[PDB]
Assembly symmetry: D2
Homo-oligomer: 180 residues x 4
């Protein structure tokens, strides 16, 4: 089974989490795992002004999402929604939606946040979009039950990285169960 870890990160927190998710997924025999990012939409000038951490993962196109059996989406919490960069990217998946290309595939979500709350709303409002594509949504339950998170007030903790690894391992296991 093919598993995509698809993420947006500005300051590296989701990037770190995405590596952990990928590690967990890679524990599952028969899971082929790849990590990609959505494009930065900010001109580099503005990204640098804001103190961003330049991302180096390969950039996904919206159309290649169709190639995977499971997609695990990472986004920072942005006032209780996904980031504009992830939203912009998902707004480019209209051609897949019309073709039913993601229908029935597994989806799961992880997030990063400060200490102000909103991470639950970010995850569940991301689920909405996944459901429009007919994706099967995988929460983590009481291994937020909605998906792995990292909370930075002011680097993810050991325990946060372990829950992220679990989410990857669990989703990848389901992907192999459904798809070989």
């Amino acid at each position: 089974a093919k598993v995509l870890v698809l993420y947006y990160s500005m300051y590296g927190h989701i990037e770190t989490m995405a590596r952990a998710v990928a590690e967990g997924a890679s524990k599952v025999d028969g899971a082929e795992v790849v990590v990609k990012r959505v494009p930065e939409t900010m001109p580099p000038q503005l990204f640098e002004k804001a103190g961003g951490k330049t991302q180096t993962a390969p950039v996904a196109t919206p159309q290649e999402l169709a190639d995977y059996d499971a997609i695990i989406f990472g986004t920072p919490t942005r006032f209780g929604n996904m980031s504009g960069q992830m939203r912009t990217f998902l707004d480019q998946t209209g051609g897949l939606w019309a073709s039913g290309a993601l229908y029935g595939k597994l989806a799961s979500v992880f997030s990063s946040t400060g200490t102000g709350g909103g991470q639950e709303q970010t995850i569940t409002s991301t689920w909405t979009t996944l459901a429009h594509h007919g994706m099967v949504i995988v929460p983590i339950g009481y291994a937020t039950p909605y998906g792995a998170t990292t909370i930075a007030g002011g680097q993810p903790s050991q325990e946060e990285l372990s829950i992220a690894r679990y989410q990857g391992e669990y989703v990848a296991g389901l992907a192999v169960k459904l798809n070989g």
Copy 2:
């Protein structure tokens, strides 16, 4: 695989939909399907005063939910939430939650509504609870993409019953794919 269609209905609309969901699930070879209701919480006197349609399906206990591979939950739209009767019933599943008994099982939701809106919110706020139990959530996508619905202003339509049948068939098929 064992599929439970678990519902609350006061005026029969969800009851009719539940039969359609069950029919669809029963199309799948290897799916064993049962339909049950959650208890009415209103004293019969008050249920009758309100013009309720007495329900005759076997009543589920909260604890038996653990026996199924997939649970398809039906609730009317009640100001954009599930009904109090379904909420009361799910508030009695604390013992299952602590034991992880529903973890990883398939869940899906259907609803009934008037013409005032709220059905999307009813379905997605039901998903939240399912996710606390670690259930895998199955939307219907563009077969609301969130689950089958029936809309009665002032009996479900042929097309509404067909989408409900589809939801049962699709969920049951996944249940057999995952569980034999």
Copy 3:
């Protein structure tokens, strides 16, 4: 302006929060505050057996919600929704809905959790129902720090942690946010209604 603090509590955490909300609201001259609870639906024997807390607050009827300018709703988090008791009570407000009785009145929400998860969803899924009634929804955001009566969660409404075992009680930091929420909502109610 008349402000109702309407709550459900099984083990007393929301009850303590409700009292704090009412204390804050009472600070506003010209706000008449009252605290009421929704009925317990569990048979008394099962409630007592479960370690439920008996409570002094009068039991509200659905009809009387019409009599207030602002209603501040408290519910524990129950798998990311309001409690069955609060949901059952709100399902009895159909007559109010049909007459427009709550349209335009202020609403705000506070909650409690065992270990944190689901609080956000409890509050926002309660907002949905308030919106069907046409109520104006008041989140708390992150208020100016000098407006809290203690120096120093979510922007959706005040919350408190009960612990996995339910034995934790609200801290003064949590209660201060609850008091702020009451004061803020009551102030708005007086501004709109005298």
Copy 4:
């Protein structure tokens, strides 16, 4: 009171709705209404190629949102969220957030869909962001029928159906609800702010 109607539209449906919202708001003496759009993020060539509609409204900056007493946000439904363009714009309001610039101001939301699905989620997931800013959220409920300027969807905010092909335009029934939403919100803004 100053009311901003801030919107995103690709094919003009939200634009037409925004104009209706502004018309309604303009009915309120003492409300100064303005309509602005968030920037298009698509390169002009791709936008034009996609059949996008060019628009007269001035482009808002994030900073200027601080200058209004009420902000009525319009966005099409994009898989049950606001558009990437509106989300990108709101992600630039961090400075406003930190200073409390929008705290306590009125917010309300309107939308559009191709075939209906997801409108409710678009509106309520936009409310989430408004709540992080501490804005007071105004749903429309089901208003008294005599307040609509046409005789005769959701209680969350006004919406309109564009059709699967995008060729449907808002009906006078839909626009009447949009006009009501503007009038209602502007009235509240004047009541709170003069």
